[PDB]
């Protein structure tokens, strides 16, 4: 069973987690620091930033919900990860949409023209399902207005790892703008979803105090803590991984471009790719591949996308070639 | 250090945990079954109950906070775990207090009279800090009332497996009384605070649902999951732990009554003991021992208690030894 609806790193669990499993087991017997100082220091060192708000979460999930729980109205850029709007409704937040254009490009001028209508914005960098990165130059006009208007902008960067360019994250913008709230995660890029760990990054110390005020002390289990402390320094897990998607992502997309029902491949910047189809529905394609124990992501339930859009994960070359050779059998049988 | 303020089972991790670690590490690369079916089955098996409402907490503290939040006005038997009240005012739930008597015993008659004025009751079994169990025979008259009047009665059984005797807990009356929301944990008795795991039980399912509608999907991490499906039925550990506490709870309570500045020791049914001091304040006694690398629980800060009260853990045989001798040291120089 190849799951191409799952976007976890194929290069597996960091070798540095095994190596410090003793640390993890030892601390089983006691409550972690209620302030998590050693954890926070690792992240600070990971991001090369001090004197920032840091919020710890049982997964990035907790932070997405909680940061959105703070406002009474949000602009959601869409298509996007279902959880933005789910949580909004979950907390009675008013929702205003901004749609990516036909090319899956942000309508920056629309975000602008709506930013007095809302209390906040949440936008993916890169965005699931289309893998789009926020153009720094164009968005700076948004940042400069948000800052001015005491508006809050929440940027989900759980995938940002898969780019490698530190200049792709807005983390290096944290000091210049305390409207920025960034969400990171160790769940996708570090291959560890079962550990349940994501984080918040902001110069807005008061907004971190407000999120902490909502949470529960010791919400972070000891292994999660052990991972965040030992795995973010793991530069050689991080480089072997970049080595992967840089090449593989580039090839995968060339192979997809050859497939006949693949009408258009949208250019990704993480470990997934959004394809527009032709002469076949995502359900028909889905139900075909399922037959072969291959799962894809039908983009039916994304706002703005229909059954011609489907999302594929980008894994290692071996699984990917297998994947494509099924896509080909479908095309053949089409 | 000797932390007699901390009440974690002293025997160490259950072997059923180390003995299955590979299953924790294997599930690192996946999201758990968002249904937690294997976990859920394990809790049913453990408690020997089927067809119930099971809340699962990232710490049993989450279960306390969430349960309480569902209400407007709440009876809190005092003194008790500082967190009940913290949560109550954290969620703007009105708090009515009910006081233990001189003997740290529950005033069931006071409860009976205050019932018509609250939405819920929360009570320890056994209670922190005294260690007293609810008298299920005198309390059935409370349950009868909250059943008929649709009040909920939250029972914190975080320390209940320490009596290792089943009629003591009210899991047995879940099927009989729908008002009952019973909270258990793996922190204290199974010796794994860092793993962050607890659960809440009820025969009333709307309560179970209404509570989960406030949680995030995948809140239980894979290690805490392996532990709850594997350890809850590790009878080597349970029996070994029960042997330990039944004996040493006797030897230590005997030995405390021998010390001179301890005016009274209260009868505890778990692994901690409440002591009333004479001719020395808990502040002082805490000061005197801290120099000996012993940290004790001053109970000055529980409601209804003053600095003439201290709580000590019932620990190891050798640990309790060194501790009474450090006590005995205090009586000398007093």
UniProtKB/TrEMBL annotation, chains A, B:
The keyword Zinc does not apply. Gene3D superfamilies: Aspartate Aminotransferase, domain 1, Type I PLP-dependent aspartate aminotransferase-like (Major domain). It comes from the Bacteria. GO terms for molecular function: pyridoxal phosphate binding; transaminase activity. Its cofactor is pyridoxal 5'-phosphate. Residues 3-327 form the Aminotransferase class I/classII large domain. InterPro entries: Aminotransferase_I/II_large (IPR004839), PyrdxlP-dep_Trfase (IPR015424), PyrdxlP-dep_Trfase_major (IPR015421), PyrdxlP-dep_Trfase_small (IPR015422). The keyword Transferase applies. Keywords: Aminotransferase, Pyridoxal phosphate, Transferase. This is Histidinol-phosphate aminotransferase. The gene is hisC.
């Amino acid at each position: 069973l190849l799951d191409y609806s799952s976007n976890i790193n194929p290069l597996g669990i960091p070798k540095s987690f095994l190596n410090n499993i003793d640390e993890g087991i030892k601390n089983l017997g006691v409550y972690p620091d209620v302030n998590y100082r050693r954890l926070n220091k690792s992240i600070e060192n990971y991001l090369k930033l001090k004197d920032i708000g840091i919020v710890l979460g049982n997964g990035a999930s907790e932070i997405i919900e909680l940061s959105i729980s703070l406002f009474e109205k949000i602009l959601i850029i869409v298509p996007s990860y279902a959880e933005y709007e789910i949580n909004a409704k979950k907390h009675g937040v008013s929702v205003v949409f901004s749609y990516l254009d036909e090319n899956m490009c942000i309508d920056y001028e629309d975000i602008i023209s709506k930013i007095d209508d809302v209390d906040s914005v949440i936008i993916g960098n890169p965005n699931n399902p289309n893998g789009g990165l926020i153009n720094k130059e164009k968005f700076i006009h948004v940042l400069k207005l948000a800052e001015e208007k005491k508006k809050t902008i929440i940027i989900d960067e759980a995938f940002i790892e898969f780019t490698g360019d530190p200049s792709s994250s807005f983390v290096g913008e944290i000091k210049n703008y305390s409207c920025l709230f960034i969400i990171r995660a160790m769940t996708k890029f570090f291959a560890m979803p079962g550990i349940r760990f994501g984080y918040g990054i902001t110069n807005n110390k008061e907004i971190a105090a407000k999120i902490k005020a909502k949470q529960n002390p010791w919400n972070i289990n000891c292994f999660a803590e052990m991972a965040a402390i030992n795995c973010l320094k793991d530069t050689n897990y991080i480089e072997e991984s970049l080595l992967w998607i840089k090449k593989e992502r580039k090839r995968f997309i060339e192979e997809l471009n050859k497939i006949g029902f693949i009408k258009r491949v949208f250019s990704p910047h993480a470990n997934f790719v959004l394809c527009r189809l032709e002469n076949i529905s995502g359900e028909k394609l889905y139900d075909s591949l399922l037959k072969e124990d291959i799962v894809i992501r039908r983009c039916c339930n994304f706002i703005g996308l229909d059954d011609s859009f489907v999302r594929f994960a980008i894994k290692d070359e071996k699984k990917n070639t297998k994947f494509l050779r099924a896509l080909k059998g479908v095309e053949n049988n089409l």
